[PDB]
Amino acid sequence: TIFEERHLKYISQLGKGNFGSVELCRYDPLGDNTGALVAVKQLQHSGPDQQRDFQREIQILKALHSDFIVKYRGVSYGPLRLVMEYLPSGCLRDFLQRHRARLDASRLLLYSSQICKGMEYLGSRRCVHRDLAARNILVESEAHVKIADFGLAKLLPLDKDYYVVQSPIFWYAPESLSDNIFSRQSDVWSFGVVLYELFTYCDKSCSPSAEFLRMMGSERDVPALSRLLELLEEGQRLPAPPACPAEVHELMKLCWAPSPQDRPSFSALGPQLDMLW
Ligand SMILES: C[C@@H](O)[C@@H](CO)Nc1c(C(N)=O)cnn2cc(-c3ccccc3)cc12
């Protein structure tokens, strides 16, 4: 739960993100390269707003205990970093592109169901993730995934079901694009895009970005966000991925209901994904 900084041996960057970075370190108290590998997060920017954002991420993660959520290990003490478990398989986005040929629909439905049970748990703790995407989901093993990257996560006050607040715009809900409103229902919208990513095996050529920019075309002077929003308000959606089982695509469309109230809950989605297998 307390890691001495002098015992955290740097290996490489996993990071690939703004404001903060995640490094692969070996917790090597014996100094012989035999200790367990850990994923260590730190904020590259200092100040009295980023440090508040960093303490909040620590507090949120420390209090989360689920098989489908990256495990908190502790914090570091030195002459402050967040210490979590390291998943050598890495993000689901890259895993799906490397192992495409052996991952069938039942396997993708198993990952979908696991992500869903993780989000149900997040909702129960009043946590809005705000950054649900395949790049933020980690592969624990062949048949097990976990939700990671809690850098944008916010706790919903007891008397509110939403929150009013830089990621690719193709994962946001219309209400987040228009009024910066975030809730468990906008995490459901994002989940719909995760199902799309999974059933495309995160192929870059039919990625939410490639497919939406292709559909948006090119507006005369209208900004791209406004364009995406006009496309979404019009009822236009990402097309069924190639060879996608029809029922999966119907589930995506429900996650993509225009109004937050009409979107299914994670609790409602779970049995539906389990039934499909
Ligand atoms: C989801 C992101 O927050 C990512 C950091 O980019 N986080 C990783 C973590 C973590 N605990 O956040 C753990 N293992 N973990 C393993 C990898 C990784 C990345 C590339 C290749 C292999 C492993 C990345 C992570």
Side-chain angles (χ1 to χ4, degrees), residues 2-3 5-8 10-17 20-41 43 46-48 53-55 57-70 72-76 78-116 118-153 155-203 205-218 221-226 228-229 231-232 234-260 262-274 276-277:
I2 301 102
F3 291 84
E5 274 293 348
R6 74 203 175 93
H7 296 327
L8 283 168
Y10 176 82
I11 296 158
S12 63
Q13 207 90 353
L14 307 163
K16 193 208 176 281
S21 76
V22 183
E23 300 179 338
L24 169 53
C25 294
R26 187 182 301 274
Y27 181 48
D28 200 27
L30 290 156
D32 55 10
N33 298 346
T34 70
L37 294 182
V38 284
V40 195
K41 185 153 172 181
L43 286 209
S46 197
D53 279 334
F54 193 48
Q55 274 179 307
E57 173 168 10
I58 295 170
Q59 270 31 256
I60 290 175
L61 195 58
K62 185 169 167 55
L64 294 172
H65 305 101
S66 166
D67 293 337
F68 311 114
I69 287 153
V70 69
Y72 165 96
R73 290 270 153 96
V75 301
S76 202
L80 193 115
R81 296 205 282 166
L82 169 50
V83 196
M84 304 169 284
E85 61 168 336
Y86 168 65
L87 295 196
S89 302
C91 70
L92 186 54
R93 172 178 44 76
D94 291 328
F95 188 89
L96 292 165
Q97 305 159 348
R98 300 198 302 273
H99 296 294
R100 212 183 139 111
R102 69 153 183 242
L103 305 174
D104 47 41
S106 59
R107 189 42 62 81
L108 301 178
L109 289 169
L110 175 62
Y111 299 150
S112 298
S113 169
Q114 286 174 353
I115 294 157
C116 193
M119 287 310 308
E120 200 169 333
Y121 175 66
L122 281 188
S124 88
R125 317 299 317 155
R126 307 197 65 74
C127 186
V128 181
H129 190 282
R130 301 189 46 229
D131 208 6
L132 194 59
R135 64 185 162 266
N136 282 335
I137 294 140
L138 296 172
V139 180
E140 171 64 82
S141 69
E142 205 54 30
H144 188 198
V145 295
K146 298 191 175 190
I147 291 156
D149 190 14
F150 285 85
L152 301 175
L155 297 179
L156 286 172
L158 300 166
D159 60 4
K160 270 185 103 71
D161 265 3
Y162 74 92
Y163 199 107
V164 176
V165 183
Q166 277 307 136
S167 288
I169 66 169
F170 312 110
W171 276 262
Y172 298 130
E175 71 276 11
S176 312
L177 290 178
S178 54
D179 303 83
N180 317 106
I181 288 169
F182 291 90
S183 70
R184 293 175 283 208
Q185 297 84 36
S186 69
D187 269 350
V188 170
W189 176 282
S190 302
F191 180 71
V193 191
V194 175
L195 285 173
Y196 178 90
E197 289 192 273
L198 264 158
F199 280 80
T200 60
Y201 295 88
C202 287
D203 193 293
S205 68
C206 58
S207 65
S209 65
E211 205 34 64
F212 271 135
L213 298 154
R214 211 195 50 80
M215 293 177 66
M216 281 150 71
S218 190
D221 290 310
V222 165
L225 191 151
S226 313
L228 180 55
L229 197 64
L231 189 130
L232 293 177
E234 272 156 28
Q236 279 189 82
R237 295 301 184 265
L238 280 168
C244 185
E247 330 85 68
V248 175
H249 180 227
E250 300 307 317
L251 288 173
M252 294 179 206
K253 290 189 291 172
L254 297 175
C255 298
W256 301 331
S259 49
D262 293 332
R263 295 168 200 159
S265 73
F266 285 110
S267 74
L269 291 163
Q272 289 198 258
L273 286 157
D274 305 322
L276 298 177
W277 303 308

